[PDB]
Amino acid sequence: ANLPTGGQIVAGSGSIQTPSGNQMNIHQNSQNMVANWNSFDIGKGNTVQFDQPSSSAVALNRVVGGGESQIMGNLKANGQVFLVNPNGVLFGEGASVSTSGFVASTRDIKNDDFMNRRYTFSGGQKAGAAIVNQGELTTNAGGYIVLAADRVSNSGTIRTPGGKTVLAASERITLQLDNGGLMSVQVTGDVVNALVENRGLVSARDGQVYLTALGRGMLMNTVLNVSGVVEASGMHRQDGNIVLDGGDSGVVHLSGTLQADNASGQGGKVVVQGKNILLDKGSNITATGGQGGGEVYVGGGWQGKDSNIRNADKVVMQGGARIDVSATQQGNGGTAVLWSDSYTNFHGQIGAKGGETGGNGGRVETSSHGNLQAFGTVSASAKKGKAGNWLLDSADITIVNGSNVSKTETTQSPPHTQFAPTAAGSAVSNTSINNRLNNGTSVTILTHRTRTGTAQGGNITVNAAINKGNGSDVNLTLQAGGNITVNNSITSTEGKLNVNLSGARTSNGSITISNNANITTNGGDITVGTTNTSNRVNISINNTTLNASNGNIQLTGTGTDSGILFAGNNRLTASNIALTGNSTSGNAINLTGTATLNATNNITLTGSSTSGNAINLKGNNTLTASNITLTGESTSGNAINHTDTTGTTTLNATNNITMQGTRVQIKHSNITAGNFALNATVAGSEISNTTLTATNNINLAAKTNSASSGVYLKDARITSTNGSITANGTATANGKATHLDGNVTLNASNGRIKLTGNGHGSASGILFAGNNRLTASNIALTGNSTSGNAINLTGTATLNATNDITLTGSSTSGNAINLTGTATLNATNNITLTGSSTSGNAINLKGNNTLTASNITLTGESTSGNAINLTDTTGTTTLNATNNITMQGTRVQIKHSNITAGNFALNATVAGSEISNTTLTATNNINLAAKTNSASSGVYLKDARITSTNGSITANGTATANGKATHLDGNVTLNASNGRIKLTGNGHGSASGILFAGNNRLTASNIALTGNSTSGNAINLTGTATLNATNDITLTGS
C-alpha cells in the first residue's frame, strides 16, 4: 500500500491517523484546515478518509515535495477537499473521489488566504505539470469539482450533480464559495501551451460545466479539445449550462457531444467561444427540450451583439457535424448562432424544429463579418406552428449553383488547414436555400458595407436559380447593404413564396433584376422596395417577368437619374401592382421598353421628380386592371405622360381610371375605362393622338398656372357609351382654359357633353379650332373670361344633339359667345345661347353658321356693345327652326342671314334692333319689339325681305330719346297675305314715329300703321311705298 507520508498540520486543527495499512483517516475539527505533505499518493485498494465537522468544512492538502500525486485508490470526505501539487496530479483507472466538493490544482494558495476563506489559486507550478483524471470523480448534490492546471485532461468520468464542474488552464483561478457550494469562478491569465482536454464523461445535471483554456501562443494549435461527452441537462440557466472558453488564442476543437437537453421543460444554453472554433464530423451540440428548445451559441451571440460571449475570429463546422436545438414534443424552436469576425465555414446540419404537436420554428444564424461559406443544412420547420428562419449575414454574398466549389473539409485537408480561406467572397449554395424553402424554413440574407478602402459592399448577386417546388408557405428576404443584382430566376411551383428584395435601411446601392431573371411566387408577394424609410435604393428591371399569381406586387425606390426603370420586355401579373418611386433630375418611374402590367384588381403608379417627370411611359406599355391609378408630382417637368413617336400606351380598366398630377399629357394612347377621369392641378392636361372610350362618365379636370392650356384635346376620339363627357379647364395665366384642335370627335349619345372653361385676364375660355365633331343627347358649353372671349368656335364644328344645345358664358371685355368659323349646330329640340359682356358683344356670329333646331333661343346682355350680332360681309348665317324663335337683348343686329321659323320674335330693350340684307320667312308671326333709349333706331329694316306664309307681321318700336321709333329703308318686302301687318312707333320729343324711306312694299290682308309723336311726325312717308290690302287700310296716330 502507499498512503500520503510526512503529513504535518500547519493551520487549523485536526489529527492524522493510519489505523490500517490500507486506510488513512484525517479528522478535521476546524472549519478550514491546511496541512502540508511530502507526497500525496494513494495506492490501489487504499482509502484516505476525511472526517470533517460539516459539509461546508474545507481541508487543504498542499504537497511540498516528491513528484506528481499518484491517486489510484478511493479518497472520501464528507466536506470539501482542495489538493495542491506543483508537480501536477494523476488519477488512475479505478480511482474514486467522493467529497462535498473537490478542487485539484497545480497552483499554490497562501495559508492566509485559505484560512480566511479567500480561495485564490495562482502560480508556483512546475513547468509542464498536468492534472489527468482517468478515474471517477463525484460529489454530493450541490457540490463542485475544479481542475486548475497548465494542462487539464479528463479521461474518466466527472459528476457534480446540481453543482459545477470547472476544467481550466490559466495563471489564476479564484473560487467564490457560499454556504457549501460554488457561486462563481474567475479564470484569468494566459499560460504557455495551455490545454484543456475532455476525453471522458463530464456530467453536471441541473448544474454548469465550464471549460476554459487561456494560451499565450498556440497560433493554430489546439487549446481546448473536447472529444467525449459533456452533460448538463436541466433547467435553462441564463449563464449557460455548458460553457467552453478557448481564450484569445489557438483553435478550439470539439468532436464530442455537447448536451443540455431538458426532457420535461425548456432546453438549456450551450456557449462555445474561442478564437478559432472547429466543429468536427461527429460533433452534436444539442440543447433541446420537451416544452421548447434552448440556445446554442458558437463563436458569438445573435449577430455578434451579445456582450457576454466572445466573438470568434473563425468558425469552421465540417460536414457531418450536427447542432440540434429543436423542440421534441410541444413548444417553439430555439436559437442557434454560428458567428465569426473573419471566416465562417458552414457545411454541417443545424436543426431548430418546432414540436410535432405545436409550437413555432426557431431561428438559426450562420454568419461572418468577413468570409461566410454557407453550404450546409439548416432545418427550423414546425409541424403545427409558423416557419422559422435561417439567417445569413456577411460582407458580400454571391449565390452559386450547387456545392461544387472546391470545398475543404476531410479530403486533401491536413489538420487545421480549414482556417486558411481561399474561397474569396461569401458564396452561398443555391441548393441549401432551395432545400430550405422546400422544407418550410424562411431564409433571410443580410449584408453590410465595411470600412472605406475595401471591395465588399453588400452586393448580393444571384448567380443560380432559387425555386420552391414544395412545402408550406415560407418567406425569402434579401436585404443587401449594397446591390441586389439578380442574374437568375426565383420561382415557386407550390406553396406561397414571399419575396422581399429590399435594400438596407441606410443602403445607397441599386437593385437590378437583369438577364431574364423572372420572379414568380405562386401566390406570394413580390416586394422590391421598402415602405416608408426614404432608402435611396433604385430599381432597374431588364427583360424580367414578375408573376405574383394571386399575391401583390409592390416596387419602391428613390434615385437621381431614375427611380424605377424598366427596359426590355417586362411582364407583371398580380392581384395588386403598386409602383412607387422618386427622383430629382430624371424620371421617377421610367418605362422605356415593352411592358405588360396585368393586375386582377388595382394598378397604382406613384412618383415624384423635382426637375424631371414623375411618371414617364414611352415604350409599348399595356396596363390591364380593374382600376388603374396614375398619380405623381413634378415642379419643372411632367407629372404623367404617354409621349413617344413610336410607342403606344394601352390602358384597360374594367371599372375606373383616374389620373392625377401637376400636368398629365396623354398621347398615342388607347384607353378603355369604366369611369375615366383626369385631374391635372398645375400645368393643365393634354390628350393627343389617342382613342378614349368609356362605358360610363368621363371627367377631365385641369388647371393651368402657366402658358400651357388647361384641357388641350388634339386629334383625340373621346366617347362615352352610356355616360357623359365632362371637361373642366381653369386658366390662371394667359393659356386657354379649354382648347380643341385637330380631328376631335366627342360622343355621349347616352349622356351629356359639358365643357367648362374658366380663364382669367386675357386668357380665353373654351376654343374650338380645326374640326370638332360633337354628338350627344345634351350638349352644353359653359365659360368665363375677363379680357378674352368665353366661348370661341373658330374652326369647323358639328354639334348633333338629340335634345338641347346650350351655350352659356360671360366675358368682361371680350365676347361671351363668338362663332367666327364654320359650324352646323343641329339639335332635335332647343338651342339656347346665353351670355354677358360689358365692352364687347354678347353673341357675335361672324362665319358661316347654320343653326337647325325645333326651337332657337338667343339671349344676352352687353353694357356698351351689341347683345345679339349676326353680321358679316363675307359669311352667311342660316337659321332653321320648326317652332318659336326668340331673340332678346339690349341690341339685336341681324345682317346677311336666311332665317326659317315657325314663330319669330325680337325683344330689344336698350338700343332697338336692326334687320338688314337678310331674308326672314316665318310660317306664323314675326313679332318684332324694340325699345331704344339712345339716338339709334328702334325697329330698323334695311333691304329686308320679310314674309309670313300663314301668319302676321307685327312690329312695335319705342324711341325714348330722339331716335327713330320705326324706320324702313332700302328694298323692303312685307308679305302677310294670310294675316295683318301692324307697325307701331312711339317716339318722344323731336323724334318721328314710323318713317318709310326707300321703297317699301307691304302686302297683307289688312295693313295698319299706328303711332304717336310730340314735336315730330307720327307717320312720315318720304320714299316710295305701296300698301296693298284686301280689306281695310288704317293709318292713325298723334
Partner: antibody, heavy 116, light 106 residues
Framework: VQLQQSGGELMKPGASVKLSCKAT????????IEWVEQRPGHGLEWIGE????????DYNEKFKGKATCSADTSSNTAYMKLSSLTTEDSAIYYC??????????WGQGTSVTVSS | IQMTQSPASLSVSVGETVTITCRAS??????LAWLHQKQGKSPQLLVY???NLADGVPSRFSGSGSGTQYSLKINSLQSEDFGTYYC?????????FGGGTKLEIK
C-alpha cells in the same frame, strides 16, 4: 469509426466466455460500448453498458451476475464476460458505440453457440 | 418500459410509401431511436432522437411521433430498404427494443 468483433465460438455447457469488440477511429474512452443480445424469436434485448474510461457499468436486471463488462483503454478494445452459459444462451452478441443519442456504428456481432 | 411495434411483417410494393409504428408502455420523451438490420448485416442506425436521421441515410426515411406513439415513414421504398426495422428507447434503463418489423418483397 469501426467496431470489429471476435468471431464465433462453440462452447460446452457451464463454461464462461470473454468476447471482443475493437474500437477505432474515435476516442475510445468517450463513448459507451453497449452489448445487445440478438436471438431468433426474440429479436434484440439490451444486455449492458460500459464506459471504458472510468469503467462505470450498467446491466439489464435479467443479466446481472451472469454478465460482466470491462474495457482496456490502452488497447482500445471492449470485453464482455458471460458466466455459466447454457443452451438457451446461444445468441449473436453485438457491441456498439453509444453516444447520448443512438447506439451508432454497430459491430458485426459474435455468434456464441452452446451445446454438448 | 415495454415497447410494442407493428405490423410484425409487411408485404409492400417497390416504390410504395409505408409506415411502421411503435408504442411505449411509459411516456418516453422523444428518446426513441430506429435501427435497420439488412438481412445478413448488423443493425444500423437510421433515425436518432425520434426525428433526426443519421448521416448516410437517404432522405426517403422520415421519423415522427411524440409521447408514447411514434412511427417511421418510408417514402418510395426501394429494393435496398427491405429487412427488419427496430425501435428502441433510451428514456428507460433497459434500453428495451421493440419486437422488430420485417419488410418483404410483394
Amino acid at each position: 469509426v469501426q467496431l470489429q468483433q471476435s468471431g464465433g465460438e462453440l462452447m460446452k455447457p457451464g463454461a464462461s466466455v470473454k468476447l471482443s469488440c475493437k474500437a477505432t477511429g474515435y476516442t475510445f474512452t468517450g463513448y459507451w460500448i453497449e452489448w445487445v443480445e440478438q436471438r431468433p424469436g426474440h429479436g434484440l434485448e439490451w444486455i449492458g453498458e460500459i464506459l471504458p474510461g472510468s469503467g462505470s457499468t450498467d446491466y439489464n436486471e435479467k443479466f446481472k451476475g451472469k454478465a460482466t463488462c470491462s474495457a482496456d483503454t490502452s488497447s482500445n478494445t471492449a470485453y464482455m464476460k458471460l458466466s455459466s452459459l447454457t443452451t438457451e444462451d446461444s445468441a449473436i452478441y453485438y457491441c456498439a458505440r453509444k453516444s447520448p443519442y443512438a447506439m451508432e456504428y454497430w459491430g458485426q456481432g459474435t455468434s456464441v453457440t452452446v451445446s454438448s | 418500459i415495454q415497447m410494442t411495434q407493428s405490423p410484425a411483417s409487411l408485404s409492400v410494393s417497390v416504390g410504395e410509401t409505408v409506415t411502421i409504428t411503435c408504442r411505449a408502455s411509459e411516456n418516453i420523451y422523444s428518446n426513441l431511436a430506429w435501427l435497420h438490420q439488412k438481412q445478413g448485416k448488423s443493425p444500423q442506425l437510421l433515425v436518432y432522437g425520434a426525428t433526426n436521421l443519421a448521416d448516410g441515410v437517404p432522405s426517403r426515411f422520415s421519423g415522427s411521433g411524440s409521447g408514447t406513439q411514434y412511427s417511421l415513414k418510408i417514402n418510395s421504398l426501394q429494393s435496398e430498404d427491405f429487412g427488419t426495422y427496430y425501435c428502441q428507447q433510451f428514456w428507460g434503463s433497459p434500453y428495451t427494443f421493440g419486437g422488430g418489423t420485417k419488410l418483404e418483397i410483394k
